Amino acid sequence: SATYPMQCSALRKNGFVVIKSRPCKIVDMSTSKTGKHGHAKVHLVAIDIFTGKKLEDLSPSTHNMEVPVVKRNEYQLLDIDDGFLSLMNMDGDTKDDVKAPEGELGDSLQTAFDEGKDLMVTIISAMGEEAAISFKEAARTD
Amino acid sequence: QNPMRDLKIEKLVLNISVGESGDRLTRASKVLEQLSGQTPVQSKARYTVRTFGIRRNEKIAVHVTVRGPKAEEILERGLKVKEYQLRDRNFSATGNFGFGIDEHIDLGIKYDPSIGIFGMDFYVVMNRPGARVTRRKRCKGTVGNSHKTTKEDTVSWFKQKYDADVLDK
Amino acid sequence: QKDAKSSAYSSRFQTPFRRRREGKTDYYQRKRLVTQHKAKYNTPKYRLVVRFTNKDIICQIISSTITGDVVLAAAYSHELPRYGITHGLTNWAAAYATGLLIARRTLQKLGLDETYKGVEEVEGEYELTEAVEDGPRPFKVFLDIGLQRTTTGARVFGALKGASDGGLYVPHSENRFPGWDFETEEIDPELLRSYIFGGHVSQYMEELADDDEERFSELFKGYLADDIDADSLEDIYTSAHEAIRADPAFKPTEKKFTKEQYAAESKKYRQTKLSKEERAARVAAKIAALAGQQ
Amino acid sequence: VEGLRRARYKFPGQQKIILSKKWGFTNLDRPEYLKKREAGEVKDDGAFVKFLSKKGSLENNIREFPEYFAA
Amino acid sequence: GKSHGYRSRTRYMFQRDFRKHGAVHLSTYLKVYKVGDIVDIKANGSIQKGMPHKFYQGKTGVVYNVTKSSVGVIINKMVGNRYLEKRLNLRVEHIKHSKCRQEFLERVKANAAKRAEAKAQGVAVQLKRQPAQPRESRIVSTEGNVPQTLAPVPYETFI
RNA sequence: GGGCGUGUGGCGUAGUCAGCGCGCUCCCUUGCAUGGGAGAGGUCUCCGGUUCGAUUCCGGACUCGUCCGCCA
RNA sequence: GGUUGCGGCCAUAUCUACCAGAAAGCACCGUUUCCCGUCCGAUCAACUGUAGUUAAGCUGGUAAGAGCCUGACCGAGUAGUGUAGUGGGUGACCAUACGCGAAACUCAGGUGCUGCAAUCU
RNA sequence: GAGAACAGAAAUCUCCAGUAGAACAAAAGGGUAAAAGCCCCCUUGAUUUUGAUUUUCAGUGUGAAUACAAACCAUGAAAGU
RNA sequence: AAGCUCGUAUCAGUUUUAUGAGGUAAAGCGAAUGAUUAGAGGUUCCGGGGUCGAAAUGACCUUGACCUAUUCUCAAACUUUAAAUAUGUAAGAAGUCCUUGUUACUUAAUUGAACGUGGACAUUUGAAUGAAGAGCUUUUAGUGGGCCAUUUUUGGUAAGCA
């Protein structure tokens, strides 16, 4: 399956959750007892990985929250044209479906490709939507 | 006494460890192939060692096994490279002996600028007739104590044949 | 000092079976051979045991009991001089002739020989002894090649081919016979027939006698001593085959002596054990010798 | 005996002080060990003593324990 | 949690033994079982197929079915307050014939032989077994066996 | 008392069974702005186990920062 | 009685170090055209039984041998244990009655037996 | 353990000893030496049809497993699996 | 509770005989695994500290490892060995033996497998003791909080504790 359930108390920091059908990454967790007799409630503060928005939800601790599958994958650039990166996989596979980043990451990547470094791109998959998060340079195998 | 106790060369094995796969490996394999007259066998690496830079299974060494009078001839060429002087440490307790040499130019192949220079390890395995008892599949047995090769017999044979002298150390 | 085994090692050691220690029996193969379908209650399972020593081929028909194995009939290659084969007693055709002899002998002593005549006119084709209707089934037997390597061209399969043409029903495929092409999965019958009639040794006889004569005097010396040339071995194989199909009756030798006559000499030659009292006298003399201050 | 009697106060329960009939830390009696050590069939170790047996190889039994066989 | 698997608590039960590991000898494959034979069940840990459960270890039953490599055995199992009938398919490495049955058959044939030979005379055959009777009168002599007087031994440390 | 997290070169940290950036120190290049290249620098908190190999997998220990310890 | 082929029980058969082996049989041994397999006719395949050798394998013997096996009234009726008492003892535990009964240790002996077929001075 | 250039504690090769002290996906326990381990070759029986039996047990279900029958296959020289 | 089919048995909280199975108690560690005390003899291309040494793959002591023969003490999740008490089966008539019928199974084969026909063996008919009747079926009540004593035993310092 694309996504799998988990418990709120089983969740912990720097893990992925589904909040309002968005892949989110937790920055804050806090548990407070509801009433003296009652079970504690978990208040979760998380950041969407793709959009960067801050989303929070509180739930019972025993409640089950949905968790996405996030895969980070490593590729080499071939060209940046029309806002669409062209990447090259190990064993020689090529994809052009990735859109170029639109922020300061995209600006730095564009300048780095213009001045000619060999750039290593990390793109993540979660719940059927695809994006690029970071780039490095290959220190060896020039 | 001595009807068929005569020592003989079971085999000569020539080992080259280039240490890393590729063009060298092929050049060392070509040198071994032209020296032996047989195609050599490359040997994989058992474990990954960082310090050597090796990883598991890249065929890091190449070796060949030659038997008979041809092996005797290459051993003659190796001994005249070594000037018929060998250390006492070279011989083993079982009776087998080996030595290591640098370059095939001393062996007389002559030099090609592409192929480079590779040294070799020569190892001679000595046995008496009747060694098939250990090797055969049916009725496999162990060789008797008197008939076993030993260090004193192999140094006596190496002094008598090849008219060589062993070093005291 | 180096080759030393502790008492703990020698006490915890478990020896294998005696035949495994001698290296003569593969018990993994033996279990799969001699075991029976338990609903066939006391039905024996019969092995054509073919063994190759130097200067002999041994063929036996053996079933298994708890007290030991039982032989119906045996046929060795050294009784082939009775049928006219004197040289090459371990070649591929000698294995064929030994298989034919043990097949004809077993069908004669079972009384299954007037039916199931086998392949009378041999040509090298691959076929099995099929069951005739409204009568008894053919005698079923399975090979025991032992530790010997299965190999296309090995002479255990020559013994199989001889036994199969003799009228035994032995299950086999044809892909281990000489002449089997690997790429085209078919059997070449004329090369197999040449091997049955000794073509591979006669062709060598010609192609070595024409050039290298000292080898032709070293080996094949008995062929010159008995004036056997290259082409006559085919018809002496044919005459040997028809002599086997005449009488496999196995007259044994006359033994030249008696069992106790051999036993007297061998009992005289064998060494005996030392008893307890003379062992004690020996150790007392040893104590008086070395420990008695010389 | 007085040292063991002083040590007995540090232990719970009841303990007894018994003078053994054995020679030292061995397991033979005093006259048995005396009639064994008059022959050469004992040989000292670092603190203990090794004994001769009638079993084993005679060569080892003669390189060890020579005075008993010096009869 | 608790654990009750199929081979739970079978450690020493399904160990092989000391110094008789390895392959099994061919007498177990050459032995012949018929329907109605009485067999003992002892599992062989070297053979994992056709294994009995740990309950039937050391149990004795009756053959009711013979197949290619196995034997069907009937055991009576106490379940609650009655015995139930259990049918087991076991490979022949895990069974052997019960020797008590063949001893009883030897008693039957020797007993019939005694009855047959003594029927020619009518000498009150007395074919039932009898247990250990009390031993009867005897006279013990002291010729070379004069009695030796014994006494209790006093106490010693012995350490 | 219990639970959770925490230690990576000075800092930020990332990680596959030790990488850069900014620091540091040199060298080189060219402003309006610079940039580049070298090095010295890390027992991945510590100690074990596992594993071909462990930052990574596990166990134990230390430090620090948190959160609970309530009804009578 | 020796040896070979196939075995059964699977050390009384194994291991260590020496010694011996008539005859026959195994074995080492000689060869690379053919079938076949290898880096390497070393193993495996094939051919000859010829050129040779009991040196080895194998078999047997030796050893106050290691191990293993058997037995003992050897330890020891000991340890342990089923049953009994309004038995002892603060207790820990221990005696007794009616029964069952070890292991280590010590000592003595032993070191393959045998089935089917073939063959042998 | 004893040897062989670079090559050493650990690279590859050779011999000897080696009852398993290794390995068999994982927890632990069993089992395994001409193998159940390592390497190579060929394959899809990890197939079809419904019954019976064992464990848990009410002798219900579920899961897992055992031995067959009727086909159709794989592999091997074959017994067989 | 209602009975039903039979009339001393296709029984038994028992013993004996024969034959299995087990890994606890005990024992063992100069037996495997693991723990563990002390010396002794050796090994240094093969350790570390000192002292003598130009230094030395030097020397002399000492201390650590490894090996060899010993020595002291142990194991719920160690074991070669291995009880007592409990525990499976058998002690016949539904048995044994002789002869020969069936089959589409099985065998090279009337070879075997299973079930049979006909015939022989009877009150010591196959050990002891006792049987109070033996076997079978339907239907339904209450119950499904337990506790104590001896012996074995777990957690706990212990408990009229769990």
Side-chain angles (χ1 to χ4, degrees), chain C residues 60-265:
Chain C
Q60 283 155 303
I61 301 288
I62 292 176
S63 50
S64 297
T65 67
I66 309 170
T67 187
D69 286 15
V70 184
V71 183
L72 294 175
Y76 299 87
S77 51
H78 59 76
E79 59 188 317
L80 292 182
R82 182 178 181 267
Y83 298 110
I85 303 303
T86 74
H87 296 296
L89 295 191
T90 62
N91 53 35
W92 185 68
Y96 186 88
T98 300
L100 172 66
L101 172 67
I102 196 172
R104 297 314 302 181
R105 179 169 300 161
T106 51
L107 281 71
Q108 165 173 347
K109 67 184 289 184
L110 286 178
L112 265 295
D113 47 347
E114 70 268 16
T115 185
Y116 300 116
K117 292 289 188 175
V119 176
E120 294 293 328
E121 215 289 326
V122 62
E123 282 292 326
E125 283 289 328
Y126 161 68
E127 72 277 331
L128 282 73
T129 302
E130 70 272 11
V132 67
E133 59 95 24
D134 64 358
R137 298 206 296 266
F139 197 53
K140 185 170 60 198
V141 75
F142 315 113
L143 294 175
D144 193 350
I145 77 178
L147 303 167
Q148 199 272 332
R149 287 281 289 270
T150 187
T151 294
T152 317
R155 42 196 209 267
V156 298
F157 308 122
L160 172 142
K161 183 62 172 180
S164 176
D165 298 3
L168 295 176
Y169 169 64
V170 64
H172 64 278
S173 68
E174 75 272 19
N175 64 339
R176 287 314 188 183
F177 285 143
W180 169 263
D181 190 17
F182 194 110
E183 285 72 20
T184 77
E185 287 76 27
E186 56 89 18
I187 192 66
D188 173 41
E190 55 92 18
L191 186 50
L192 188 55
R193 189 186 186 276
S194 80
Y195 267 55
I196 288 166
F197 281 137
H200 71 308
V201 299
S202 63
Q203 182 254 333
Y204 188 31
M205 195 159 190
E206 288 142 356
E207 81 166 276
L208 183 144
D210 62 345
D211 46 10
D212 196 294
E213 283 79 14
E214 58 273 17
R215 274 221 200 200
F216 195 65
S217 61
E218 284 144 32
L219 72 164
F220 323 111
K221 179 197 298 157
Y223 290 85
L224 281 71
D226 308 333
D227 79 9
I228 301 299
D229 45 353
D231 46 353
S232 64
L233 61 83
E234 198 264 357
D235 54 79
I236 76 179
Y237 289 146
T238 300
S239 69
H241 292 170
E242 70 193 0
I244 296 169
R245 300 190 104 101
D247 50 280
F250 181 57
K251 268 172 285 297
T253 62
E254 278 78 15
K255 310 295 184 169
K256 292 181 181 179
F257 278 110
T258 68
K259 281 262 196 170
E260 60 271 3
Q261 266 173 316
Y262 291 122
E265 180 153 323

Side-chain angles (χ1 to χ4, degrees), chain E residues 14-80:
Chain E
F14 291 162
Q15 293 179 356
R16 202 73 151 82
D17 61 357
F18 192 53
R19 294 210 337 260
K20 314 164 169 313
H21 291 250
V24 296
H25 50 87
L26 277 296
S27 287
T28 76
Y29 297 116
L30 285 174
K31 275 169 73 176
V32 174
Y33 303 98
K34 303 215 299 186
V35 162
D37 289 332
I38 297 169
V39 285
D40 293 338
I41 286 164
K42 180 203 180 74
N44 200 304
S46 172
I47 309 301
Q48 284 86 33
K49 270 185 158 60
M51 281 215 68
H53 192 255
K54 67 175 147 188
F55 176 78
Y56 304 98
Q57 171 89 352
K59 252 60 170 195
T60 302
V62 170
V63 177
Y64 83 102
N65 182 44
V66 177
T67 177
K68 168 173 74 54
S69 78
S70 298
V71 175
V73 186
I74 295 179
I75 316 293
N76 292 326
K77 179 165 184 193
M78 188 171 58
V79 184

Side-chain angles (χ1 to χ4, degrees), chain A residues 12-13 31 33 36-37 72 117 136 139:
Chain A
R12 63 180 65 249
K13 207 187 60 178
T31 67
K33 306 286 294 300
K36 13 189 208 169
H37 321 106
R72 327 184 294 240
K117 295 219 193 79
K136 312 168 51 65

Side-chain angles (χ1 to χ4, degrees), chain B residues 25-109 111-112:
Chain B
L25 182 63
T26 64
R27 297 186 320 257
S29 84
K30 285 162 50 188
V31 172
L32 274 185
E33 171 284 345
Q34 63 84 30
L35 188 68
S36 64
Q38 316 172 9
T39 187
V41 56
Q42 302 176 357
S43 297
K44 284 171 178 169
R46 299 179 298 182
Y47 293 100
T48 299
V49 188
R50 319 204 132 234
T51 59
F52 310 142
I54 51 181
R55 354 171 40 245
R56 185 157 51 91
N57 305 343
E58 292 83 4
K59 290 295 212 314
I60 78 184
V62 58
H63 71 102
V64 73
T65 308
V66 182
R67 304 180 187 263
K70 184 169 50 176
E72 196 272 333
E73 186 258 354
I74 317 174
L75 163 70
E76 293 179 353
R77 284 196 285 177
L79 284 172
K80 70 175 53 66
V81 166
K82 218 66 176 180
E83 293 84 4
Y84 299 96
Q85 183 62 255
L86 294 174
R87 317 286 307 272
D88 205 318
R89 290 203 54 90
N90 294 351
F91 296 85
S92 76
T94 67
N96 292 319
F97 67 98
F99 56 92
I101 61 156
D102 284 348
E103 68 272 15
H104 51 276
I105 301 299
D106 291 331
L107 294 172
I109 302 299
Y111 184 66
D112 191 285

Side-chain angles (χ1 to χ4, degrees), chain B residues 4-5 38-39 41 65 67 130 132-133 136 138 142-145 147:
Chain B
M4 173 185 328
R5 301 268 313 270
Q38 316 172 9
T39 187
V41 56
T65 308
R67 304 180 187 263
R132 199 207 172 191
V133 178
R136 67 195 198 201
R138 191 185 182 265
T142 182
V143 63
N145 294 354
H147 183 74

